[PDB]
Subunit: 388 residues, 4 copies
């Protein structure tokens, strides 16, 4: 049989994996090795695994390829390495990239500073307006780069529309699908060419692995592996990290269901609360791109942003008053995580520059975990009441 | 007390490490985490660990910094990532690098193809001739890059002399110290600015970790961390890999002593053998740069190359006749590893091009392990006798 | 705050765990150490951790204690070690145990052969009939031992009733709660004194850890630790196994929900199938002790047994015809597992002796996993159709 | 070829291990699995691995069997589990054991209290006097149990002589070889029937694994596995712990050489020091059983005990004044460990009872590590000078 034919939950559990033919071991063994041995000079020449590949990591790459409906996968040392290995494989001096402005922070630094120092220019646009992408394209544009949903207000990008635009002008579309996971969104099915994830978030899900994955056509992935990893970033994933990610992703379906069920309850609670001015969540019909979300996403996700009354000091008081939610900058973990960018990560940044970046003084971001939603709601209500 | 004051074996065991103050645990705990939590909004802003750093990996970086007599260390996903994170941190389009030609293979691809595609030009020279390095320097030269000893005939580069030349012309010297480990050679003490290793080889030593390390001044390492890793390669080392490397490096001193004691015995045996035309080993007085080796290296290393009578077919027969030595392309493991580049790794490469690269049809490379030297010698003698 | 006050899902995620006070690490660090160090002679005497305890394993023990509503937990090397460490701590030569007959196989060997060789006699009874337990009690009875649900037909034992009987006659009740997990059944809340689990099954859930847990009063657990583990079995759990179990148990709630939702669908399908003579599942109203199950269990579990038409050869053909279900003797994993005891595990056992043990020639046992239930059903239907 | 024919260092590296036939992986894969799968009903019946065995742990057991020159090995959860699994497999109510009195502490509790509660009586004797062993034997004696060298003064037991006595009277000899490792002593070669180790000490050597090993005839080991582990202690070793022990034992030869070379230097220093009244070390000719040690042990070991002038307070001051040596109760680690039993572990024990146990107020025990011996000596001298 072929796991590409089975239901998505079945694929999550089985795809890329099989019992060890040699031993019958059901768990994928951890091939924690650097060295692979040949039986003869002839076998040595023939193969020329190699530890540009590894049997454990191979299982993870094959699984994620099945889940994203792509041909092949490539695991990396971090989400940022998945992004840079991809873009540095595709681009050389003189090339151009059109990127969404609403992207993850260290992606922005790589595109803003690193790429131009290698002769690769980047134009940043508002990707919620596909016409801005079209207008920014140039004869030298190799790649359009988008993230959806995007920080910090969970705005969306119409993947199918953008893919059509990119392709008409001879560029590839790369989509960072980290926030959704393949359980909730499948960019390749909508016309994207390449998907990247930080598996650090939902794919692993257990807050104990830093890692990335790239999924795309075999022809591209081979280049990302034999040139990008081998000759540029060196960002390979360790076999133990691959094994942990394989283990975490086993529960991706049930975890995403619970994250999203919890998040919807919490988003509705926050929307009903008189001390909360705004709530950003694709699952609320008041979301600016609600209907696009319903077509493109199977679930509205586990992340919520919201603005508390009273600006900077209220937001600080609120996060200082939670008892259950944990203060941290990651997302996609089993524990509910909360952060207040204006007092935490962006405190040195000038208020008016924060504002330009969509970060208001009162904005809180919440990564909803697997706890009982009544407990998370009660904790939020407690902290909100105190802060306001 | 301060481990920088203690003997080298004491440093190998203790430097960068201490019992866990919280629990008393002697082994460095494995901080297998992606997420770090803040106790308040204020603590969050203050720190802005972060998982651009990790307590386990920090211990490894501090240890290797002590051992190389550098200020700071930075762990990476692979030896190649240590090299590319370094050079991509230092160089931008329009910059120039002078590199030894006798370098590790995937370093050569990065320098030959990847760097020029980012607008960074590289001149390759014979670094055994320091005048060639001087002659190749340009106003835009940022870095001189060397490896010593170098594949495939274990030629040397005079680190102190090259450092003086590089510095006089305003460039940094980066040295790949992988083959020696800090137990046998200390490039920073000889004037190098930056040392890189693949810890995949001797530093870990157990053939089960792919990883790299960079050691240098705090000011440089900070840039390699906060720009190179964060914004370019994303090549961070996982905490488990760091923990395994910490564990492997505990025995670095006793392992290097045994590797080198074994290697000298084997090199002398091979030098006495009438079916072996040449033996390349820094420990033999017939080595072209023997006296330089005696000043610059505390031991002559665990690697030997040698040429067997009868060219390509003899070399193939020989490696096909070993019973104890294992056929593989890595080095620095506890097991003795052997390879015949002409029939294994370089078989597709044209004979005359192999020859230009110092790879003769009969050249065998041997990574000497920790087995009884009489057993390794008996195995070699057996295979040589059969092959010739 | 106190996690004993929060909802069960919140407890599953958080109980026994907290960010590392020293570093802020959210994941419990893996304290993979044998050695703990003292700061002074005085601190050494004072503590006399010790590695009869470990910070990682402590977190697991505290979590499971919260989840079972017991005072304290003790982790072990295997489920069987949890059982034997308990019973060998409690019993000495001349003591007596009343045990259910319908128990796990290697528990039966320990009770049948090992215990009597140490002078500890065991009476086996049908624990579905509490009067049989009462009738078997003796002045020297220290322990009543039960498992519920029990193999192979998922019969039940009324925990509250049995606890009352045991206590009236001055004995402790120990319950193996492995099949249910604390998510579905809480024996201590029903009057049991001690709960044991093989965490190898649902608690870990990922088919990659062998381990056990014991939960009970602090006074008993201290004895099981400082006498049973230290001075009898030596069956301690490794910190890495504890860390993996902590990680697996994070998803216990969502996993048990899905296992049981899937199992109910499959049990109903099997009950409607004309080639299946019997289906044993607590979730079917036709189950002999259905109402007892509804009071004592919050969900009916992820395990089903059923009898296929055509006896031994039909059962063999059926398991040889599945494509998705994996043939194995474990349970509680994310993958659906299937076994046919009469042709697999009990083939050497005489047919009439198998029959006495409740194992008919046509009995199949199924551990329902997290795959799509339609896929599991389609696979079963396919194999059943072929086999019959 | 057969590793039983090779030199001991070669065996240490290679025995029990081979590249993975399926993949070529040189490192033994970590089979971190609980579940093994069958390809058919027939294969299921046939095997009835099983996770009473595991491919990773199997490699460790086979290696240690080669190194001790025994037929078979069995890994366990701890050294104490190796001991109790052995003795509870061999003995039943009514049986008798003759044991050395000078044994490891938690072995003493198991023999003194646990065994008699199961109807198994134990006679303790001074095993340095083989006549005391003979005089204590009874018709029901199944086992003679010895440790050599023994705590706390490193007295010896003549293994060959004791084996002859045990055998003449129809008993087995079990030897705890933990202090020596098979590199320094081979009890089976001297007539012992069974060897046990805590691998927690030198075999693993890295202070990060708790575990045990049993080595003996296939017929016995099968019983220890299929009855002792399966049906009594449940004390199996986890595959990750086995993998770490495999990795640690790779350097056993070079580690034991350095431990013993360091220890001899330190013992000679202490013997020359006027504030040290006694030094116990088999490598000093003043050792009461020096010549026996020279025949039975290939090296004199890495452990030293010594008495400091000034009794209890001097010993306390001394250990409170070390800067490099770490205060801990384990041994065989890469770091030098020191303890003062009278002020640390035996402080509650009455002075006259301590004295009976060979523990004087001034006795210090030292586990010599791999640091530079001059540094350890300088640290000891510093602390001794201060304390006296
Ligand atoms: Na991004
Ligand atoms: Na290099
Ligand atoms: Na049981
Ligand atoms: Na002992």
């Amino acid at each position: 049989s072929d796991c590409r034919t089975y239901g998505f939950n079945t694929q999550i559990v089985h795809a890329g994996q099989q019992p060890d033919p040699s031993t019958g071991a059901l768990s994928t063994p951890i091939f924690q090795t650097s060295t692979f041995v040949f039986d003869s000079a002839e076998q040595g020449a023939a193969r020329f695994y190699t530890r540009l590949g590894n049997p454990t990591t191979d299982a993870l790459e094959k699984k994620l390829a099945v889940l994203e409906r792509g041909e092949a996968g490539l695991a990396t040392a971090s989400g940022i390495s998945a992004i840079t290995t991809t873009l540095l494989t595709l681009c050389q001096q003189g090339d151009h990239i059109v990127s969404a402005s609403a992207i993850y922070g260290c992606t922005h630094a790589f595109l803003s500073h690193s790429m131009p120092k290698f002769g690769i220019n980047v134009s940043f646009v508002d990707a919620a307006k596909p016409e801005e992408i079209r207008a920014a394209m140039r004869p030298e544009t190799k790649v359009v780069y988008i993230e959806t949903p995007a920080n910090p207000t969970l705005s969306l990008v119409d993947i199918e529309t953008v893919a059509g635009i990119a392709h008409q002008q001879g560029a590839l579309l790369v989509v960072d699908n980290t926030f959704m996971s393949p359980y909730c969104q499948q960019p390749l099915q909508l016309g994207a060419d390449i998907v990247v994830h930080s598996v650090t978030k939902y794919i692993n899900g257990h807050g104990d692995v830093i890692g990335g994955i790239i999924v795309g056509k075999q022809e591209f992935i081979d280049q990302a592996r034999f040139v990008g990893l081998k000759d540029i970033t060196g960002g390979c994933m360790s076999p133990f990290n691959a094994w942990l990610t394989l283990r975490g992703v086993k529960t991706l379906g049930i975890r995403m269901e619970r994250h999203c069920e919890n998040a919807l309850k919490i988003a509705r609670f926050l929307e009903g609360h008189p001390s909360i001015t705004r709530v950003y969540y694709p699952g609320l019909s008041s979301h600016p791109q609600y209907e696009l979300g319903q077509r493109q996403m199977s679930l509205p996700g586990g992340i919520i942003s919201f603005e508390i009354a009273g600006g900077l000091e209220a937001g600080r008081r609120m996060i200082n008053s939670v008892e259950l939610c944990l203060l941290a900058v990651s997302l996609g973990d089993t524990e509910t995580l909360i952060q207040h960018p204006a007092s935490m990560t962006h405190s040195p940044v000038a208020p008016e520059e924060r504002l330009k970046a969509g970060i208001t003084d009162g904005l809180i971001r919440l990564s909803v975990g697997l706890e009982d939603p009544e407990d998370i709601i009660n904790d939020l209500e407690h902290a909100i009441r105190k802060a306001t």
